[PDB]
Design a protein around this nucleic acid. Structure first.
Ligand SMILES: [Mg+2]
Ligand SMILES: [Mg+2]
Ligand SMILES: [Mg+2]
Ligand SMILES: [Mg+2]
Ligand SMILES: [Mg+2]
Ligand SMILES: [Mg+2]
Ligand SMILES: [Mg+2]
Ligand SMILES: [Mg+2]
Ligand SMILES: [Mg+2]
Ligand SMILES: [Mg+2]
Ligand SMILES: [Mg+2]
Ligand SMILES: [Mg+2]
Ligand SMILES: [Zn+2]
Lengths: 144, 216, 37, 176
RNA sequence: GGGAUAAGUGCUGAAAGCAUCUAAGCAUGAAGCCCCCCUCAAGAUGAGAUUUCCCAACUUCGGUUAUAAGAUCCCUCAAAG
RNA sequence: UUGGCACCUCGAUGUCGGCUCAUCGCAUCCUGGGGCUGUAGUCGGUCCCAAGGGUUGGGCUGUUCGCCCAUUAAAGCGGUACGCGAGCUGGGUUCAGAACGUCGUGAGACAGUUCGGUCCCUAUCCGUCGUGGGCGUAGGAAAUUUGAGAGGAGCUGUCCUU
């Protein structure tokens, strides 16, 4: 007998969290945040709807790497023009655009679906300790 | 660092102090007024907005761009100026040296100033690869059926496509163009004209923007 | 500089060192400078 | 690490004070402050200091030796200072003082100016013996190295700027 | 011209009492990298910013309405096509 | 590269060279930076970093190559269906004519030669170069704009002085 609960927009409640990147490892913080954004931490998780929460990440500039990733991890992109490869190292990207670093790391751990795009749009990253979302009343979230 | 707006009148020549022939462009740069002052605090960057060439006042049943509409009239009246035909910002100037409503006379530039001139190049319409991109023709004889064609657009199975940036026929000219390191030959304050050494982009009557040259 | 997979002393004054992950020989004799590669 | 174990002797005129890792040594000639390895402990005696490492790991031994050497260098720099002497070889190769800056004429079509830095003093003798004096051994070495690299010694006649005790390999320039 | 680098060149420096450009630390170093220069660019759906303009009646009181600012149709044209 | 194999294609995947248009790699020809030298200087030799840009007209030959004339800072080496024939050519090569040498009794034949000898196609899709309309960007409008991104550019001689 079919009895499995299905979340839908009428009964989904999305909260706002704040997570501090300071002293955290890029990938491990990223995987946890991605779980939160997808709603894998809710007993009402329903794959065809977004049951996830909004996440604000602060102190993106204080994320840390192990090994020599700061100089040796290279992000490549292509402009779709011949010879159009451009690269930037992980350390330089942390220096110049830490928000983008965190965002790409997290979004690479979300499915490439319309729903995954929408869920990734609930992510907000800030290099410093302040965010403009006091109006959303976010709760601190402790990793792990 | 200075800036002004003018119309291209045409080309002529002047004889220099040693009798050398100096080709010049005549730029009429009357009726330049500082309409707005943009600042880092309000707008996020510093610049002066200059309006050039008074147009007619707003009227009820206006049908052309000759008459200022109400938004433009309000914007200009805030500076206490008549409405203007062309409006451009200069970021290269010291904003503190200008007041809104100020006149910008051709006398701001002096003979010998090195300047950059920006304009819209003359339009050519739809043009082929030889004219638009300066390519070579094929043979005109020896059995040729390739004269003005653009040539091969790719290779083969690798890459089974044409790459972006391939040069092909299309509209030519009408581009923003900056010519750097021209020189102010003369300033005629009675006629409100600047003689610029050489030639500058665009048709006659086209808007030209003169700035202190960026490279030094 | 001698750049070669085989880096080793050429004379008794040659000194094997390691810099930036590379085996090298430094010596009073400039001919004997070697970097592995 | 014998260097790490070795104790630093403090002259009576030199005072060493620690603020966690960061340390500062004052003496007759000046003050030198720097941040030492955070995992190293310091036994501060009235007249001497000793450096202690926590373990016998490779990193601990290396950092112990270098920390002891650096602190001893700070002490000796405040006490006696450090000096490096270069000399100029070649006809017309001369040096002189443009106040505090050093201007060198060494076979170039232009003179070369070396601007003085804080805590460093240049002195020219006989127009051909330059000396750099300071409290920082590292800074003295760096500035002397810059002076020498302006034109280092060439092998066919030895001309150029050398450290006074430096041995310059010589070569026979011309043969039939 | 600036910033960071390559091969290098060094300073200080231990592991390893010496030595050592390297481990910590500090310099310097290419037409190359990132800028500086020129052009496009907010469909940058993350759709940004500034200045100015317009602003009421009627309503089953959700909403509508033609009008406003404005822009077009149509017409005379060219520096544009 | 010369091959080996015979796996796609024989209800067709056009084949050498040239022209037009390039694009990429670096194992670098020049220009930039270095180490060693049996580097006096001017020159060189050899190796390392470096792919930004640049890297010529002619004589002969179908030629590619190659030799030669004259230059240049230099006259790089390769991949892209030995790039590119629904972009061009058609000299060679691979139809039918004819001929020479040669082989064959002969009909004929020859990576032997010679002279002659039909190169079709109105672009549907992606791709590419231009140029418009719709809606969105939580009121409707006119101007001025930031710059996330993207593209362009990037080469070098000689002489004078020191
Ligand atoms: Mg024809
Ligand atoms: Mg393909
Ligand atoms: Mg060998
Ligand atoms: Mg078989
Ligand atoms: Mg078929
Ligand atoms: Mg290479
Ligand atoms: Mg190159
Ligand atoms: Mg081919
Ligand atoms: Mg084809
Ligand atoms: Mg033929
Ligand atoms: Mg045959
Ligand atoms: Mg015939
Ligand atoms: Zn040796």
């Amino acid at each position: 007998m079919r009895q499995t609960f299905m979340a839908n927009e009428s009964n989904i409640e999305r909260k706002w969290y704040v997570i501090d990147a300071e002293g955290q490892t890029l990938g491990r913080l990223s995987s946890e945040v991605a779980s939160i954004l997808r709603g894998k931490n809710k007993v009402t998780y329903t794959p065809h709807v977004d049951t996830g929460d909004y996440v604000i990440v602060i102190n993106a500039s204080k994320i840390e790497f192990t090994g020599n990733k700061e100089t040796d991890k290279v992000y490549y992109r292509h402009s779709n023009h011949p010879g159009g490869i451009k690269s930037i190292t992980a350390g330089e990207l942390r220096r110049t655009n830490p928000e983008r670093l965190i965002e790409n790391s997290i979004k690479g751990m979300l499915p490439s679906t319309r729903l995954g795009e929408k869920q990734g749009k609930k992510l907000f990253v800030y290099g410093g300790a302040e965010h403009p979302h006091a109006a959303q009343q976010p709760e601190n979230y402790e990793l792990r | 660092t200075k800036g002004i707006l003018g119309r291209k009148i045409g080309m002529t020549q002047v004889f220099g102090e040693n009798g050398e022939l100096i080709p010049v462009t005549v730029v009429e740069a009357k009726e330049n007024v500082v309409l707005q002052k943009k600042t880092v605090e309000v707008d996020g960057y510093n610049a002066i907005q200059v309006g050039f060439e008074d147009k007619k006042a707003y009227k009820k049943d206006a049908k052309s761009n000759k008459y200022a509409n109400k938004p433009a009239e309000g914007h200009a009246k805030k500076a206490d100026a008549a409405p203007k035909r062309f409006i451009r910002e200069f970021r290269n100037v010291d904003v503190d040296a200008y007041e809104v409503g100020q006149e910008v006379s051709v006398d701001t530039f002096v003979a010998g100033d090195v300047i950059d001139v920006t304009g819209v190049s003359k339009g050519k319409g739809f043009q082929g690869a030889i004219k638009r991109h300066g390519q070579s023709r094929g043979p005109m004889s020896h059995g040729s059926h390739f004269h003005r064609a653009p040539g091969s657009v790719g290779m083969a199975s690798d890459a089974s496509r044409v790459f972006k940036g391939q040069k092909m026929p299309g509209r030519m000219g009408g581009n923003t163009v900056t010519v750097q390191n021209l020189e102010v030959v003369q300033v005629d304050t009675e006629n409100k004209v600047i003689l610029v050494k050489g030639n500058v982009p665009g048709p006659k009557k086209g808007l030209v923007e003169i700035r202190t040259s960026i490279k030094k | 500089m001698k750049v070669r997979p085989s880096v080793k002393p050429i004379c008794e004054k040659c000194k094997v060192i390691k810099r930036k992950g590379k085996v090298m020989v430094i010596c009073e004799n400039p001919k004997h400078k070697q970097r592995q590669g | 690490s014998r260097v790490g174990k070795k104790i630093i002797d403090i002259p009576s005129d030199v005072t060493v004070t620690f603020d966690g890792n960061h340390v500062t040594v004052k003496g007759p000639k000046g003050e030198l402050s720097r941040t030492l390895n955070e995992r190293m402990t310091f036994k501060q005696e009235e007249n001497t200091i000793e450096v202690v490492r926590p373990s016998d790991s490779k990193e601990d031994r290396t950092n112990h030796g270098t920390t002891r050497a650096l602190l001893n260098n700070m002490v000796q720099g405040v006490s006696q200072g450090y000096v490096k002497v270069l000399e100029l070889v070649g006809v017309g190769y001369r040096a002189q003082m443009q106040g505090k800056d050093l201007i060198l004429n060494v076979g170039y079509s232009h003179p070369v100016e070396i601007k003085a830095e804080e805590n460093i003093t240049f002195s020219v003798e006989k127009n051909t013996v330059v000396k750099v004096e300071g409290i920082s051994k590292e800074q003295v070495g760096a500035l002397a190295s810059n002076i020498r690299s302006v034109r280092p010694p060439e092998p066919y006649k030895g001309k150029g700027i050398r450290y006074q005790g430096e041995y310059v390999r010589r070569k026979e320039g011309k043969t039939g």
